[PDB]
Design a binder for this molecule. Sequence first.
Ligand SMILES: COCn1cc(CNC[C@H]2O[C@@H](n3cnc4c(N)ncnc43)[C@H](O)[C@@H]2O)c(N)nc1=O
Ligand SMILES: COCn1cc(CNC[C@H]2O[C@@H](n3cnc4c(N)ncnc43)[C@H](O)[C@@H]2O)c(N)nc1=O
Ligand SMILES: Nc1ncnc2c1ncn2[C@@H]1O[C@H](CSCC[C@H]([NH3+])C(=O)O)[C@@H](O)[C@H]1O
Ligand SMILES: Nc1ncnc2c1ncn2[C@@H]1O[C@H](CSCC[C@H]([NH3+])C(=O)O)[C@@H](O)[C@H]1O
Ligand code: NA
Lengths: 343, 342, 343, 343
Amino acid sequence: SVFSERTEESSAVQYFQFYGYLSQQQNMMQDYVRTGTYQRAILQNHTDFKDKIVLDVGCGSGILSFFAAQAGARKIYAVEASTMAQHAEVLVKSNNLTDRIVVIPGKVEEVSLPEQVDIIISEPMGYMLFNERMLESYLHAKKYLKPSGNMFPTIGDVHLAPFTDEQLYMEQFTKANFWYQPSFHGVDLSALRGAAVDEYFRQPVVDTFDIRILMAKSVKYTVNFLEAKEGDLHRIEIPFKFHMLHSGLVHGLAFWFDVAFIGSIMTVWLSTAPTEPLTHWYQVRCLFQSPLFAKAGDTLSGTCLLIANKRQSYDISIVAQVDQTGSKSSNLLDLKNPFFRYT
Amino acid sequence: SVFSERTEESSAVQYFQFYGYLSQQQNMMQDYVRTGTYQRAILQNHTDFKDKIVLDVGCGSGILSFFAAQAGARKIYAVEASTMAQHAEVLVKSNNLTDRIVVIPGKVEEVSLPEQVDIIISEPMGYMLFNERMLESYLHAKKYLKPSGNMFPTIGDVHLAPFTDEQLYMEQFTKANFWYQPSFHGVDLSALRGAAVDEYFRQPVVDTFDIRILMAKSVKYTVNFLEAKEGDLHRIEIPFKFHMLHSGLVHGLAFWFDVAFIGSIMTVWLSTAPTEPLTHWYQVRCLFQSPLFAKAGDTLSGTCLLIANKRQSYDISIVAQVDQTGSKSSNLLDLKNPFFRY
Amino acid sequence: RSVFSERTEESSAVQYFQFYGYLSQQQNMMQDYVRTGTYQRAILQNHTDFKDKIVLDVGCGSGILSFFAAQAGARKIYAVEASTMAQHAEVLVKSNNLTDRIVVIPGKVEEVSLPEQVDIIISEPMGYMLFNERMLESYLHAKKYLKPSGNMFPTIGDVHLAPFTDEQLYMEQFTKANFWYQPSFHGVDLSALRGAAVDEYFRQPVVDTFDIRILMAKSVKYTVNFLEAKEGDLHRIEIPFKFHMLHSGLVHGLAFWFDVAFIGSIMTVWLSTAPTEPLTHWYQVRCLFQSPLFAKAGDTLSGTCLLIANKRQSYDISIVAQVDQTGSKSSNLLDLKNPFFRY
Amino acid sequence: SVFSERTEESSAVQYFQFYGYLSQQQNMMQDYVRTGTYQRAILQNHTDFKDKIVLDVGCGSGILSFFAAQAGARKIYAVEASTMAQHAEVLVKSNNLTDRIVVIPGKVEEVSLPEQVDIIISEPMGYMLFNERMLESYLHAKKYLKPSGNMFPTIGDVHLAPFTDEQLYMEQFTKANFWYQPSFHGVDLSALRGAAVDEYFRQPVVDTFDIRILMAKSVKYTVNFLEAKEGDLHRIEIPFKFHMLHSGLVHGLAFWFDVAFIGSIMTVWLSTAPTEPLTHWYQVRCLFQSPLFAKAGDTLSGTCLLIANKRQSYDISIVAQVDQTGSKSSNLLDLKNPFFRYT
Ligand SMILES: COCn1cc(CNC[C@H]2O[C@@H](n3cnc4c(N)ncnc43)[C@H](O)[C@@H]2O)c(N)nc1=O
Ligand SMILES: COCn1cc(CNC[C@H]2O[C@@H](n3cnc4c(N)ncnc43)[C@H](O)[C@@H]2O)c(N)nc1=O
Ligand SMILES: Nc1ncnc2c1ncn2[C@@H]1O[C@H](CSCC[C@H]([NH3+])C(=O)O)[C@@H](O)[C@H]1O
Ligand SMILES: Nc1ncnc2c1ncn2[C@@H]1O[C@H](CSCC[C@H]([NH3+])C(=O)O)[C@@H](O)[C@H]1O
Ligand code: NA
């Protein structure tokens, strides 16, 4: 199948074991911004669901399908690949909705639906939007979408912005300098100090921050789920040209994302921006190996290249340069293993 | 190999991927009780290493091998299956010990060792001692051990004792009670509450605690690493009979462990007991879904059964009984996925 | 049979009037200084409403309010009491030399015969959550003896209800119900009765006081005008509510209290049992939800509190509540006659 | 039936309503001394239950029947008159003992048992043993007992002892002196002070105390449930003659009770003595109207006469006298309405 070919078996096992936990579902469900906004987006666009055929990609507990049922849906196919599918089925029965919601255990790339659907709903967003590579499942599912069919969410915007955070940058060296001692119990650890620094900088940092560390207006990269193909997400090139609003040292790039539910009645936005109330996605920061000095008015140009890997994530390549000075910095990061810094 | 047959590929990949990180090595190395006690046990028993052949099972960064080198060992084979092995090689070169420490990359069940060794050193203890199933690798490695060779550590004591902690219990019960709601955003979740309680209580709690929550003298289960066979750890049955010292609610069993380095000069103990300074093993508690009320003087009887699984851990079944009232409790826990509360 | 006996089980009535036959209970009520003091002020500061008037005291007990009416210059006071306390009231009338002003009439106010119509009716018919004991109906029934322009002391009653958060109370009750969760109490599996146990405990309104900050919204007020209301109005009391949540959190239930007003010719005097006011022997009453409802600030909590009078001189309470923004719903049934005294 | 003739209808209603609550059953079940001792007495005398026919009088939740089942009983008839009977049925089913425990709804004086039993088990004890008059139900049940049959408990001992408690005695007057004031809000209450004192002294005091207040070894009155008639409990005359161990003022008599389970293997005792751990029965004290002075070595003689009434309780008559001085005191108390003093 399409899923197995793009996914290492070891990664897939871990991945679906993770979502097999009721606590993990619960964690997502208790993210009120997320869950509430989904329910709002569905109910406020009830004309998009009333007596419609619905597909829920990766239903988990089945909560979105229930929201679709609340909106008056006729039939909802709730596809789930982890063992959570059995718990979703129990909920369908206990909520007396067996006539409207059909839980289909398995990967959306492998299961079969009896009919085409009017609208696809899903929550496939990971860290930096693209983590977990579930957007491709979401896009793959369009084989079951009627022409003129709709997608909830419909589009996704990932935002990038340069930031200054001296403490975050110095923190890495403070942690790596553990190895920079000549006699740890009689052992000289110094030779590994470089490797330690390297390791720390490969980890994207997950947490939140004050918006005042941002030094330029964000650059936006948009995915239209109605138009995109899964293969479009294998190689994501995000060019940027930041016009610096403040003078100072750029320590790296901050990432966040919005999704839009473009319905017939209204468009509802779900945002994980640092200007908005915190979600379980927080924000993500990728550090530069060497900070870049910029004057207000200077331009910071370059590219953020996301390359999909078989561990259900992306290898991040970031190249940036201050055009006025030619001062350049790059970093390679491993999105699969972020550092959860939030406290 | 013996490792591969008893281990799911999915588990091993993640497992050794985890130990390839320098931050994790730093975390373990910064456990001063551990590192200091190991160095203490090796250096003070230097005659057990002087001009001897040493095997370091799961050497990681190689610290124990350096300790063995400090004790005057002639040759040390440092085996590590994670990529950390490459970092160990770097330290050996930079510490000018290339003539004495030989890093052998790979699983100890799969590598080929050049010669038989006089002594095996290792740090194979996981949470509640048995987690990670590395003790079996440690035991497996005795195929390279000379007839009268030694092992560091030499023995392991697992201690279990009944505890009372309403706060911890309610803390987990609260998390499970989310699945109690009859109308979460209009959705009835209650039918899953049973499965939810089951899931949360299967998680052993890793953290530390005050010793005054303990309601009886601990029961000891000992593994002699010099004598034990790999197969001995597939099924670990620990019967217990506690004489309750305090009245109250028994919320579960607390676990910790000691290991002893029985050398020629002296025996050095490394303890993770809650009466001792804290280590990175902390202590482990297994909660009962329903606590058992017991009075002082009662006997708390039952069995703690550990069944090894293919995910490099154990399925824990605890059956406990207040003999005077017949109050019985049964519990199943997944040692692989503990709750880190510390 | 009289209107009283038909709406009252004899078994309940016996216990009820037997309870009020005890001097200790009279002492308990009389030692409520807020209560007694406020009644005395309401009567004395409106002395013109009593001067040379004919008074009816419904459920006079020890006769304290009749003495207050006598102090304000009443010509004759008919003090009706159905319990044996009537005998003690008479003793006080004689020992206080007020035989020419206070006439104790033993019996139920629904059954006795008065020689004449009265200018004003005084009573203290309030129970827990105002309506408990169903004496308001006796109070209203007595209006058959009231002259057309007659007055009522108290004149009006306000019931206040507001949502509250109190995790401590909820877990306190939940823990008590969880006794029946034990699978091996002395070797016996009790679990099958947990549902019945939870139901039983949560049917008990909690009588006590609390800090006002646990309240999550402005109280909704329901008013009974004793000058206009008829007995039948209290047989089935429907109180709709729409709360605008001021705080985010878990709604564990609804808090209840009441005010009564003595609207006299000289001034209006209020007797309040609100948690913002000094504590009375009425305390406050809280009705718990079996499972709390999550609400954000700005949300609306709407629904209905329905009180159905029963033959045990109390009410069957039904509370239906809903977080409108999410559709999160709770339904609960309570037995007001058997509250939990927590103070 | 025998029950209805000796019981006022009004009393019976509240009585069985009281035991219809799971919380009250729970209250009894959480008395570890009581429940544990019952279980222990049954299990340690397993030969008295093995393959026997058992009768459980007033099974409540059915706990004692389950204990009988644990001891290997062949058939257990669990008779229960309150609504608790249905909850017992639920527990029997849920514990898979449907073939061995049969729940019979109704009063034991009115139901029909298909066969005679080998042993009757019950927990019919109230305050000072005899309150609630359920022992008569217990003894009545022997009509279903084989001639060679046993009773669990087998005997009941009531202990009586003189006590000194200056605080308790003075407390009555302190509470009554509320009424001894000439202008309570302008009212002279003094005329009721006597009636108030009378009221307090009629109430036996339920609570516990330090054994240091006891001034003589208790006098014991024994009921052998194997030998006794129902009628033996209609009029209970307990003569007493105490040999005073301490000098001082005797303010009244303290009451407690024991029951013994005399089985074939061993005799197990359940005690509510103040020398033993506290149970939900506590202890009961009856005050003398006027305290009696006695020296150590004097004899305190008299009678405690318990006269059964139709309110499922007893009128307590106490006459006591110091023989050496002729100093005499009496009290008449209403056991149905005790004062719960325990804190
Ligand atoms: C819960 O505590 C975690 N923990 C675990 C351990 C156990 N030691 C694991 C170390 O040993 C390595 N290891 C595990 N199984 C191995 C095997 N078949 N062959 C070779 N190396 C192996 C593994 O890669 C790591 O470097 C420890 N020594 N300290 C700890 O803190
Ligand atoms: C929480 O207790 C509420 N509560 C109620 C009351 C109301 N009861 C006062 C007095 O009213 C008497 N009473 C009740 N229904 C009556 C009736 N049809 N006819 C005559 N007397 C009646 C009853 O004998 C009692 O002595 C009060 N005076 N204080 C209170 O505290
Ligand atoms: N290819 C796939 N096919 C089916 N389910 C998948 C696939 N990839 C991910 N999932 C599931 O999709 C879910 C994403 S988490 C979202 C859970 C739930 N729909 C909610 O909105 O709260 C997880 O439960 C995954 O197990
Ligand atoms: N005459 C009677 N017939 C049947 N049941 C009765 C009678 N009198 C009292 N009971 C019940 O006897 C019980 C006394 S409480 C003892 C309950 C239970 N056997 C236990 O040991 O925990 C109550 O549940 C009463 O409803
Ligand atoms: Na320790």
